Design a protein around this nucleic acid. Structure first.
Ligand SMILES: [Zn+2]
Lengths: 467, 83
RNA sequence: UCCGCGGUAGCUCAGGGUAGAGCAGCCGGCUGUUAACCGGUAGGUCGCAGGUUCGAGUCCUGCCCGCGGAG
């Protein structure tokens, strides 16, 4: 629907100002109940929507996750520490969309600092799943997903560290891409695990994902970890193998819910009638990756969130003593954050560094290896984004049960591989999603594959009306 | 293998002051988590391709915009409680 | 320095209500033992000094000592 809008705009049938007014209204009427947006781009939207021409993304408006810097707009990262913080600079990704006519609708709700898998850890309020108001939209990009599924926005930006983009996309029945680590800039991302974080696009169609990535991705002189690889995404004008080899991961086959297994089998039939060589492969240590993640990520998180004392920009807790002030200000963290940064401090702490961090590092290198070897025999990998559909609020009381939400999604980040999450059915009016993987840098290929699947069927629905 | 003393030590290192209620709570969580992670198997274990930035000046923030983030400022300085 | 296991007969280690067993020692038995074994018996700063308890080897505060482990 995104590319459809830009079409109507370029032909003069509609003006960008018209599109904004339309979406702004829808938000003001539906968001109250949904709770997808934290902040909204004030008068600076209507004003900015009437001072643009015929650029590629003119009529488009984007919903950005609130841990991504937007100059002049409140960027809270879903935390109390930053509930009044407004960046004097703009995230490279966002900056690029803006230069192509795009505009920010508002900022999306997330789990505090991106650490969460249900949005139930937002310092402000939970977000509701448009398909079922009694169930979570996933996390931590729960807001962005929820916004898309309710057509509160044509485009959306999210953040992925352990599936924070894929898991929500699955729960809300939309597309979520985690780009090869290095494709999109991290400058402007209030990130928590530097080695694993990546801004990811999400949309209601694969052609739309192409629009975002083509605009957002690319080398940034400010990010020393960014790759010099031209996007070239919108060349989804298919000359697609036929005949790619697809490898299904055994380890992720057992433990899935009826609707996931069902959606999985059906997808295979589809890829076969498409000309793909489907074969079962082995991801030996994949099941043990969840552990390595919850020792590598927390480690980096402790050091990344260390800067949040009340000295220069956060909230000040009021101590009057400085050490005491720092100690009191950080107490404003949520239960989940505290939990993770306490783990992170332990894993790096003296006497435990090699025993844990050093251990998880060596294991992280195994996965990359086992993956290199797998892509010597196959061209794509397939598994569920999650073993089940969105769960109802209240479950996942045990912090561990929450972590195991990212059982299948952690592999992507730990290795760095591109991973796409596409809709693949419904476990009874509940959207279930499947996860495609490709070798490093072959983002465009898995999108191309995603198109074939999408075209081979038309299976995507919107819980709320779409304008 | 996690004593209440370590928690204290950790919360010290992280400069995070939690309530005695949270301490008892997190004490149980951390235990379970550190057990889950400890299950990680040990295994045996690249080329340097990093780049450098040119020594060319880039415009700075205007003092006004910088101090606007500060909870407390005084005569062009960031103001914090005393040591 | 920190952390984790230890400190009980002589030696090597068992365990909130006389502190125990086999090795050797003592007494008694046995002509082929290889670390002989059978009975009986003697053997104590439970680490040291302070607490809870009616009662502490056992639990809890500090210290001494040994081994091991950390970038
Ligand atoms: Zn500078």
């Amino acid at each position: 629907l995104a590319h459809e809008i830009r079409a109507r705009v370029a032909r003069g049938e509609v003006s960008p100002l018209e599109v904004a007014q339309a979406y702004l209204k829808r938000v003001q009427e539906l968001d109250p109940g949904l709770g997808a947006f934290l902040s909204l781009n004030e008068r600076l939207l209507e004003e900015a929507e009437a001072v643009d021409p015929g650029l590629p993304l003119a009529g488009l408006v984007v919903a950005v996750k609130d841990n991504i810097a937007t100059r002049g707009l409140r960027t809270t990262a879903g935390s109390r520490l930053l509930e009044n913080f407004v960046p004097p600079y703009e995230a490279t990704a966002v900056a690029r969309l803006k230069a192509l006519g795009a505009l920010v609708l508002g900022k999306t709700n997330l789990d505090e600092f991106g650490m969460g898998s249900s949005t139930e850890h937002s310092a402000f309020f939970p977000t509701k799943n448009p398909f079922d108001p009694d169930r979570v939209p996933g996390g931590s990009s729960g807001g962005s997903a929820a916004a898309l599924a309710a057509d509160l926005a044509p485009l959306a930006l999210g953040s992925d560290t352990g599936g924070s983009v894929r898991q929500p996309a699955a729960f809300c029945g939309v597309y979520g891409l985690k780009p090869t680590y290095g494709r999109v800039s991290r400058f402007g991302l209030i990130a928590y695990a530097s080695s694993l974080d990546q801004i990811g696009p999400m949309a209601r169609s694969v052609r739309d994902l192409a629009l975002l990535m083509d605009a957002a991705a690319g080398p940034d002189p400010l990010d020393a970890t960014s790759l010099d690889l031209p996007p070239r995404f919108q060349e989804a004008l298919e000359g697609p193998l036929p005949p790619l080899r697809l490898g299904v991961v055994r380890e992720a086959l057992a433990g899935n819910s009826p609707g996931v297994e069902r959606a999985l089998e059906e997808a295979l039939k589809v890829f076969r009638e498409l000309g793909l060589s489907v074969r079962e492969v082995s991801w030996p240590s994949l099941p043990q990756a969840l552990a390595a993640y919850y020792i590598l990520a927390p480690a980096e998180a402790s050091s990344n969130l260390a800067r949040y004392d009340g000295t220069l920009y956060g909230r000040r807790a009021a101590g009057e003593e400085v050490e005491g002030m720092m100690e009191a200000t950080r107490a404003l963290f949520g239960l989940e954050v505290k939990r993770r940064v306490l783990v992170g401090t332990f894993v790096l702490s003296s006497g435990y560094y090699e025993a844990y961090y050093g251990r998880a590092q060596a294991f992280r290198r195994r996965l990359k290896a086992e993956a290199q070897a797998l892509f010597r025999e196959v061209d794509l990998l397939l598994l569920p984004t999650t073993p089940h559909p969105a769960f109802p609020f209240g479950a996942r009381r045990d912090p561990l049960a929450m972590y195991r939400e990212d059982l299948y999604t952690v592999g992507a980040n730990l290795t760095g591989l591109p991973a796409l999450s596409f809709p693949a059915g419904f476990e009874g009016h509940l959207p279930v999603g499947l996860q495609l993987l490709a070798p490093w840098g072959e983002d465009e290929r898995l999108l191309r594959a995603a198109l074939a699947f999408e075209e081979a069927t038309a299976r995507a629905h919107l819980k709320a009306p779409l304008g | 293998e996690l004593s209440p003393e370590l928690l204290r030590k950790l919360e010290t290192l992280a400069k995070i002051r939690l309530s005695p209620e949270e301490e008892a709570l997190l004490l149980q969580d951390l235990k379970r988590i550190l057990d889950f992670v400890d299950a990680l198997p040990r295994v045996e274990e690249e080329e340097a391709l990093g780049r450098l930035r040119e020594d060319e000046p880039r415009p700075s923030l205007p003092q006004a915009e910088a101090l606007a983030l500060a909870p407390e400022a005084e005569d062009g300085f960031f103001r914090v409680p005393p040591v």
